[PDB]
Design a protein around this ligand. Sequence first.
Ligand SMILES: O=c1[nH]cnc2c(-n3cc(CCN4CCC(c5cc(Cl)cc(Cl)c5)CC4)cn3)nccc12
Ligand SMILES: [Mn+2]
Ligand SMILES: [Mn+2]
Ligand SMILES: [Zn+2]
Length: 456
Amino acid sequence: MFLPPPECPVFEPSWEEFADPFAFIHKIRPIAEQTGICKVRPPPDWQPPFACDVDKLHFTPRIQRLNELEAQTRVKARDYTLRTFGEMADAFKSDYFNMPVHMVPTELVEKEFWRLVSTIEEDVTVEYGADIASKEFGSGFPVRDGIKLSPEEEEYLDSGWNLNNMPVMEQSVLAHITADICGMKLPWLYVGMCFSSFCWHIEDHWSYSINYLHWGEPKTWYGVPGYAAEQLENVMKKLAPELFVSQPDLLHQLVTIMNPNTLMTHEVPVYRTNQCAGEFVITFPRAYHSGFNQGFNFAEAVNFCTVDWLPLGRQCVEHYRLLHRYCVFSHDEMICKMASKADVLDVVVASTVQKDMAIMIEDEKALRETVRKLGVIDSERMDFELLPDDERQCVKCKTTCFMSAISCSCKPGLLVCLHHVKELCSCPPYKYKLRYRYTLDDLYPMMNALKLRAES
Ligand SMILES: O=c1[nH]cnc2c(-n3cc(CCN4CCC(c5cc(Cl)cc(Cl)c5)CC4)cn3)nccc12
Ligand SMILES: [Mn+2]
Ligand SMILES: [Mn+2]
Ligand SMILES: [Zn+2]
């Protein structure tokens, strides 16, 4: 028996509201962050055309065995076209229920999905065209390509809700990052079939995500608000310990399927929604989510970070350090990059960056005084941004260094962050060297440019 969680908020913005996606996302934030996910219905006449061919685009989908509480890899079998996948998808659903595929009630698919994943001697597997790269396959939204594009797709070309634009706009703080993260600047495509699923997870660096269903049968979501993140993690710790064993890579994550009623039983707040074609779902920072597809469909998604998010981004990297988990990028390097472009930042952005930078500088000041008192005296400037990430990860906590690190001639090439000075080697501290990006004297004028910028 399944008792569906309460419905998450649904917004229908006017065209005035809709005009600026970052303004609207900020407006709804007090509501939507209480529930983790929300749904956004665009104005009725906002209807972007679809830019992908059914025969000339191929992919190999991941196989999915329907079993609850059981580890999978976050990123990990024949080849299909969009047409052949859809023929497979539709045949599966109609055969499964012995019905025409639109006559299957969404409530029934939902009951049946949760029955399926918890019943052990039913062996049902499905496939999911998941994590297909926008860059190779092509966006479902209109893009500029030196083909010609019809007028109607030229209106949608510059829309903030065109997901190609969202993470490159100026109120998105990830825009300024030069490093081709790709995992976080570029849209990803999901081709679903009935019962194909995504496990409970949160986004890298506790970022937002926005998901658009271009067409097909709905996508069912469950969401948990950010404030209940650790509570959900505690609940999952008791029931399925294996997922929490520290993984030796950022591409070795362990996620799982778990009944939202099990969470609700343990007083974790869960909300649901059926996202239909032409609707957006937004996930908020550190908000756990999971779900499954009702049928053959096509979705596109991207991460993004608002200025609202900057302090959480700092907190997240601190949390990764405690977990010894790899970073996608250095948060500090991103702050300093923006500071170095202070003359051309949005003024609200420059104001928010300056606030985070002040914390960075004070925390850096305290850490440096501490390693000095430990006997590290030798120091030398180092341009950390030039090192590939894997060559500047702390040996202990795996954090990507930028502000500073400790090295020793004893263990060449190795670095620790300043939290793990005692973890580098066994040589005395006077053999150590402090590598730093900036003197405190470099930092304060950078912050000043931001202040000047913000007060104009
Ligand atoms: O409907 C859904 N279906 C599937 N997944 C959903 C979902 N999320 C999926 C992700 C993981 C996306 N993944 C991150 C790593 C990315 C990456 C980066 C790099 Cl440099 C190399 C590689 Cl090989 C891969 C590829 C894209 C996060 N949320 N959230 C909500 C909804 C859904
Ligand atoms: Mn099973
Ligand atoms: Mn997600
Ligand atoms: Zn460290």
